[PDB]
Amino acid sequence: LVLNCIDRLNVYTTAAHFAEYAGEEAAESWKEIVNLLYELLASLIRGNRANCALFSTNLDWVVSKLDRLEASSGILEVLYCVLIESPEVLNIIQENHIKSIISLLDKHGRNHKVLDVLCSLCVCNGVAVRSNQDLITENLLPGRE
């Protein structure tokens, strides 16, 4: 139900666009509502392995929203909670996902939480993913920028 609410509220690019259909009095709380929705989703998914494993099917849903200017921190926290718990998501993570996260670093600046996410992508429960380590090395180090 929360996911459906987020998807339906995400179809508007900005508050003014939402105001063109719901009015200004309803638009002044659009950003607050979406931030609360992501905060509740994070509280609902923190620490539950079964719930984090539920995201092994729709990971692109979370990744494609990383570039949104609103609730950027909440969505990043949701991704961090999923990745720190579910090894299946690491087995489903692909190159386009890693390139998207690096572009997140490139566009939103030097944030240590993105670095912690990349660190978490490598090893989970004492087992390392060679493919992830190689893709990160190939797509992050040689640029030297």
Add this chain to the structure above:
Amino acid sequence: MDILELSERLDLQRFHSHTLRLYRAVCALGNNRVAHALCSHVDQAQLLHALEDAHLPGPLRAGYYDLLISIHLESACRSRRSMLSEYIVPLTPETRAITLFPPGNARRHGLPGVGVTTSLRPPHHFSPPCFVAALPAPARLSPAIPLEALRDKALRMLGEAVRDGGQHARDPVGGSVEFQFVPVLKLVSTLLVMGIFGDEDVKQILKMIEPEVFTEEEGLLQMKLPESVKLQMCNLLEYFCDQELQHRVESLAAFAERYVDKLQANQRSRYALLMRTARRTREFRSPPQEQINMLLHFKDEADEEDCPLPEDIRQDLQDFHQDLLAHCGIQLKPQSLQELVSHMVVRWAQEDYVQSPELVRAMFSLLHRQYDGLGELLRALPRAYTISPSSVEDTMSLLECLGQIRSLLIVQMGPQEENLMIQSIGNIMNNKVFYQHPNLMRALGMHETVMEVMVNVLIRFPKMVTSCCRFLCYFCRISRQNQRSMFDHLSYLLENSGIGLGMQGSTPLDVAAASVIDNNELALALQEQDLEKVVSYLAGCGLQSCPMLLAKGYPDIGWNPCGGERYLDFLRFAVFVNGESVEENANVVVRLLIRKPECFGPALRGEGGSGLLAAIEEAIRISEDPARDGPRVHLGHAIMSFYAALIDLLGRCAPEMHLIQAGKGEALRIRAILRSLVPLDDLVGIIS
């Protein structure tokens, strides 16, 4: 800007520290290729400068120390640590020269960790980094760094830190005593485990730890330090306790070699004079283990009558037992490691309430080890084994391959690791020692590791699965003890030998079948639960079409003759041993089969269904018609093979003739049931 400005620019200090954490993450767990790539970014000169930089912030100093350990030492240290639990002692003259106490009932204790050790340990392999060589596969080796210079630098830095700590400077290096000592102690512990330090270096380390006890200034053991430093001191003392245990094992093996030689010479002389009555000749007509049990059964003075050993030899053995107890400190200012460790641990525990559970566990494990030394040796003897000097090169090669396999237990499976595993198995099977010394192989426990690898993969890697299955089949076929060892995991294999056998090669069901062949004891120890599980699998196989065949476009039939045949031959080996029928299992299997009649297939089904001859004729017509056969498996042949296997199994379940003559009611009942199931006329029709 100068990197020292990060002491005030905290945002960049944190970002760079997490960057170093990411470097360790990417090169973690044996990724030597990434370690080489990282060598282009963080070079040796920078690392060495960072080690001696006294103004560096604590987090950066710790990060660079851990980066150096991760890049250069982690893989070698881990492989050596894995190899440290075994004691393969060659019978060389250096081993012969080993004694419990130095020549200079009980004498003064020697220095721990100094002396001659003959236990086999594979050498480390390193490759020089280079980024201009033509780009070429064999696994890459770890980068090489000057170890003698690194160990000298570490010793000098630790000594300087010790002196500064004695001075109690108000500006400790790194901002805190923890940041001053923990990285250095981690580096020293890693180098100690890798065994780089020599005798003089170990003596210097022992002098800094305790200059008064380890004499042939003030120590670390009496200075107030935090829990992390206490933990590193516990790791060091654990290392030296392990070295003492290894020394005891090597001395015991040397004495065993000398005493066995004396025993053989004495027995040869006694037999020589005896050749010139059952009591006199019983010794030489008994198995050698019983012979040596009788020869060594003279410990008590109330049974020293039957022992023919001379009193001088008995005295020699009693003298060695006495000096073994003395070396273990069993009574017949601290001056020994055991008393030093006990005093330090008790003082620490009664001075403050320890909050670190890891530290608490470490100190109580060490205390238990000091108090119980004989039991530790007793539990370590099963992993000790003496080998001939001519098999050293093959044993070292086998240890290298086993180390590679063990290094493959902490990495996600891939095509390259699969190829490495396959070639390692081939190299192991190409070694004569693997067949000459089966007891040593069981003590090494390769089959447990292979089974654990197999369950971790569980089909994505059929070549790997069939390679593991062939290895275990060979292992069972070497000796009966291996077969008995594998029989304990029969249920473990069966629960994973479900649908998805693979249409490739040997399967866990095949290894399980190979683990019970020609063994009456294991056949009689075969549990009924395993047989009900197998019959339940066969029943499931007998009701649905084969999904792989359906995915390959074969015509649909409501059963799987191939899978049913595979379970049938397993029951054939389970019920027929050494040319005779085991009636307990035959009766159980037959009763289960009749309790589940749908296992017999569309034929013999009842309430509609033709006999065996009609089924065979239909199969023949299917074979003669290509459209009904294929879309390589031929359905007509599979069906005939299935019914042939079923009839073979029922025939082998038949009661014995001596039982029929004895008139056993159960035997007559079983034969009557089998006769009712299989008419004679159908048999003659098929034979015709």
Add this chain to the structure above:
Amino acid sequence: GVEIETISPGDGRTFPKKGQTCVVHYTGMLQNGKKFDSSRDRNKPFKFRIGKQEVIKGFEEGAAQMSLGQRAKLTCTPDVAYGATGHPGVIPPNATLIFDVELLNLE
């Protein structure tokens, strides 16, 4: 190809011949100025023998034209320096490389 810019004159009489082992010090940098490799940091001269495809083509083409004691700049084009694939994690695709090479000894 390879361009050679001399920085310090050599002997100018003794050139590398077939089969000889050359021992050199080098520093390898990218065209953007970023340094990626240097043997001087390891404090160990790099040794290789001529004509056995042991190094990238441009490097040995440059070193073949250098005399004993000479210091020179070698420029290597992408078509010979690792080509289109580059070096995973160290050198990006289509990188033109710059080498500061000094020929210390032969055999």
Add this chain to the structure above:
Amino acid sequence: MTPLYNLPTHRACNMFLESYKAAWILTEDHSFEDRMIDDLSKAGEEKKPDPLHQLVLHFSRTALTEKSKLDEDYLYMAYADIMAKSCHLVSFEEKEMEKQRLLYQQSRLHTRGAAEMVLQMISACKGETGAMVSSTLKLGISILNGGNAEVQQKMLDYLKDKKEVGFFQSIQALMQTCSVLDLNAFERQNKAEGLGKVMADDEFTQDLFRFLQLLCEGHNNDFQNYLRTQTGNTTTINIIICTVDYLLRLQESISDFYWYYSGKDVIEEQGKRNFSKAMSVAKQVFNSLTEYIQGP
């Protein structure tokens, strides 16, 4: 039997090592448990806990850690054995001297939370038989021998305040997993020995019922009623009925074993041994029921 001196040297050395370890090392007796406990129980020069107390708190912490299954730890097994072996070790005067020394040795343990540690470890095992539960039961018997009233009170108070059902669920599962005789297994063994087990966990069953008997020793009516019913708990488990159920299964097995040997005049050694151990278990069960119902 080729003579020993014709064997290769390394193989003979390996056989020597196995024989030496089997005949000389294990047979040695070394008693250090009392000295170790004495050393750990002394402070020196709110009272911070002494080292033994911190050890017990550490094991209670790992017992209370929320995890699906408790991992095996040799360190805990070793210290549990040491603690159990350090607590037990004719005229009126020395009989009383022995009782007082036993009470002091038990006080050194039960005054540092050992009873609660035992209950927590038993609840943590969740009814899975093994060395962990066997060591815990042995320690509980060691600290409960002589039906110490103070220990009984501490256990009852802890159970009533926690109101946890895991303890009795584990006890019920263990009682349901206790094994009895098996004629099919006996026949299989007879054939195996003819080519040229039965009640393996009898010691575990005996110590389980000895522990239950010691919980009610001394006519503890409060503990007898608590065993019959747990008022404060959400669910109630009747241990008495489970005991009768096991007694019935044992009786039926004994009856079948008697009919099997009734026809034959001679009874072999293995049959006599299995009869003896079955009778010993039945004796322990009868004693436990007697302690359940006395008081009355």
Add this chain to the structure above:
Amino acid sequence: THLRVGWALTEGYSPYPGGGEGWGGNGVGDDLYSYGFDGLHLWTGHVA
């Protein structure tokens, strides 16, 4: 080894030890107030 010779302007040429433009080690020709010559290159504006 670094070695350059040339002219510098009083105003603007204040090279401090340590860090600076690009990689540290600023000398003559590393800014627009100085004009150096090292034997092989003409240095100005941190460009050789």
